Amino acid sequence: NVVQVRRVTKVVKGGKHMRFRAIVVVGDKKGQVGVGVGKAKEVVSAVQKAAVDARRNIITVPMTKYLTFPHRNEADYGAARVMLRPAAPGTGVIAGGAVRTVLEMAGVENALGKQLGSNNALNNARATIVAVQTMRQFSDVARDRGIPMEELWK
RNA sequence: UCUCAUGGAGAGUUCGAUCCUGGCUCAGGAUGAACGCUGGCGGCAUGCUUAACACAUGCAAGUCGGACGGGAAGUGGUGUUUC
Numbered sequence A: 001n002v003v004q005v006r007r008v009t010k011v012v013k014g015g016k017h018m019r020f021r022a023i024v025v026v027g028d029k030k031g032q033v034g035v036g037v038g039k040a041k042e043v044v045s046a047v048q049k050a051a052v053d054a055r056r057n058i059i060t061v062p063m064t065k066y067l068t069f070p071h072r073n074e075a076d077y078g079a080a081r082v083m084l085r086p087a088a089p090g091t092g093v094i095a096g097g098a099v100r101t102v103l104e105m106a107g108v109e110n111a112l113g114k115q116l117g118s119n120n121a122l123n124n125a126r127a128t129i130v131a132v133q134t135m136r137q138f139s140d141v142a143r144d145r146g147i148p149m150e151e152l153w154k
Numbered sequence B: 001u002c003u004c005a006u007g008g009a010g011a012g013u014u015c016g017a018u019c020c021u022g023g024c025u026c027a028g029g030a031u032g033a034a035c036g037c038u039g040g041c042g043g044c045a046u047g048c049u050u051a052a053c054a055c056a057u058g059c060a061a062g063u064c065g066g067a068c069g070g071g072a073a074g075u076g077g078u079g080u081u082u083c
Ligand SMILES: [Mg+2]
Pocket: none
């Protein structure tokens, strides 16, 4: 999914040397997502390199039986700050551009998200990833703490 | 994987490009609203925010004759009953 296409420029004695930057995110819509960035002369080739880069950067988002987040979480990258919190089933995914495309492409069905701080599409994508990467799932906190599930549920 | 949550969206704009700080601007709701165009019906509401500025006319607080003396309408007369 192409999130953003921009025309960045290097400048040479001749003139303006134009390239396209592509910010693209890949997912299966099944709980696997990644971001990648690429640069080329034509839209098409940039897009492609973006794809290939993302595919080698990719991670998994912890999901709950209703397709949402285990818990509330913040995230920080650059000036991008990101806030995600789980939602009741049937609220869909409400968020802004980077955060929402990444979330949606992961397959998260119901989530609240807001990016505070900056708006750069890219850093918000990365940030989202750092958010959902640090998501601990209950089985694992029960494994860490060394305490049975039913005890923490309470 | 029980319980809670029924909730927080962004976008353009400084640069040859970038990241940031930072303002302006927009998308939403609400009116005791006004103006423009257009206008079939019904239901329930609303209607001088300004000059506590002036007011023509008409009406918005009376009733009791079982407190009381009278007179005025009739009636034949203080037997009747009204004002
Ligand atoms: Mg900071």
